């Protein structure tokens, strides 16, 4: 039997997938899971919650007049 310890929050991540699989009853669960994470990532991106990549291009812009 498998008993594993996982990072704080990963339980919730799996639970979100699981509850949506149960809600939708996909005929092909693995295909549904790939779509689930794709859409979750789009939602995270739109909210501004993508992790900051401080070595990556500072591609966004902020303006304020004085």
Numbering used by the authors: 7 to 72
How did the manuscript describe this experimental structure?
By combining bioinformatic and phylogenetic analyses with structural approaches, we have discovered that the docking and dimerization (D/D) domain of the PKA regulatory subunit is an ancient and conserved protein fold. An archetypal function of this module is to interact with A-kinase-anchoring proteins (AKAPs) that facilitate compartmentalization of this key cell-signaling enzyme. The sperm autoantigenic protein 17 (SPA17) is a prototype of the type II or R2D2 subgroup that is conserved across metazoan phyla. In solution, SPA17 forms both homodimers and tetramers and displays a weak affinity for AKAP18.
A construct spanning amino acids 1 to 75 of SPA17 from D. rerio was expressed in Escherichia coli, and the resultant protein was purified with a sequential three-step affinity, anion-exchange, and size-exclusion chromatography (SEC) protocol. Crystals of SPA17 diffracted X-ray to 1.72 Å. Four copies of SPA17 are observed in the asymmetric unit of the crystal. The two central copies of SPA17 form the canonical four-helix bundle as previously observed in the homodimeric D/D domains of R1 and RII. Interestingly, the two conserved sequence regions flanking the central helices of SPA17 both adopt a regular β-strand conformation. A four-stranded β-sheet is formed from the amino-terminal β-strand of two SPA17 molecules and the carboxyl-terminal β-strands of two other SPA17 chains. Alignment of the SPA17 structure to the D/D domain of apo RIIα dimers results in an associated RMSD of 0.482 Å. The AKAP-binding site is, therefore, retained in the SPA17 homodimer, although it appears to be occluded by the β-sheet formed among the terminal strands of SPA17 protomers in the crystal. SEC coupled to multiangle light scattering (SEC-MALS) verifies that SPA17 tetramers and dimers exist in solution. Homomeric SPA17 bound AKAP18 with an affinity of 9.6 ± 0.69 μM, supporting the notion that its AKAP-binding site is not blocked by the terminal β strands.
